[PDB]
Ligand binder design. Structure first.
Ligand SMILES: CC(C)[C@H]1CC[C@H](C)CC1=O
Length: 160
C-alpha cells in the first residue's frame, strides 16, 4: 500500500525502526556521526507539528532524545533542529510497513542530504530496500554512502 504523496500524518504515528541510512557525506551517518540516530517513535504534537523520540550514543550508552518538528511553508516539508537546521519530507510510505524520509541539513560549511528507511519492524522486504537504494542513487548518493543498520547496534536493546 505505497502512498507517494498526500500522506496522512496520523498514520505514520507510533513505533519505527531505523533500517537503512544514506548521505552524500558518509561521515555524518557512520559511527559517532551527528546523523547516526535511531528512530524510536513519531507522534502528532499538533495540527502542524510532530515529535520524534530517537536514540543516540552518549559515552557508549544508548540515550533518548526528543525532537520537535514543525511544518514549513512548503507542502509536505518539516523543519527540525539537530546539528543545525534541517528540512525534511516524506518520499513515500506504506504506513504499516515502511517510510522513506529525505532531509537537508542547511549549514554554512557544506550542506548535505540524508536519506532514511524506517520499518514498522527491525527489517523490511529486500524489495523495499532496493526501492530505497534506487532513490538514493537517483539523488546522486553513491552506494558506498548507503549504510545497512540491521547489522549494527541500533539501540534496539534500549528502546523501552
Ligand atoms: C534527526 C534525524 C535523524 C531525523 C529527523 C526527522 C526525520 C523524519 C528523520 C530524521 O532524519
Amino acid at each position: 500500500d505505497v502512498v507517494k504523496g498526500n500522506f496522512d500524518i496520523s498514520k505514520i504515528s507510533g513505533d519505527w525502526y531505523s533500517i537503512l541510512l544514506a548521505s552524500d557525506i558518509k561521515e555524518k551517518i557512520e559511527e559517532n556521526g551527528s546523523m547516526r540516530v535511531f528512530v524510536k517513535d513519531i507522534e502528532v504534537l499538533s495540527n502542524s507539528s510532530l515529535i520524534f523520540t530517537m536514540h543516540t550514543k552518549v559515552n557508549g550508552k544508548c540515550t533518548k532524545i526528543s525532537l520537535i518538528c514543525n511544518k514549513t511553508e512548503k507542502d509536505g516539508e518539516y523543519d527540525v533542529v539537530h546539528d543545525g537546521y534541517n528540512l525534511f519530507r516524506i518520499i513515500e510510505t506504506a504506513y504499516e510497513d515502511y517510510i522513506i524520509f529525505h532531509l537537508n541539513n542547511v549549514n554554512q560549511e557544506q550542506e548535505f542530504q540524508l536519506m532514511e528507511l524506517y520499518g514498522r519492524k527491525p527489517d523490511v522486504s529486500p524489495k523495499v530496500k532496493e526501492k530505497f537504494v534506487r532513490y538514493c542513487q537517483g539523488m546522486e548518493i553513491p552506494k558506498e554512502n548507503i549504510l545497512d543498520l540491521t547489522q549494527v547496534d541500533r539501540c534496539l536493546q534500549a528502546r523501552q
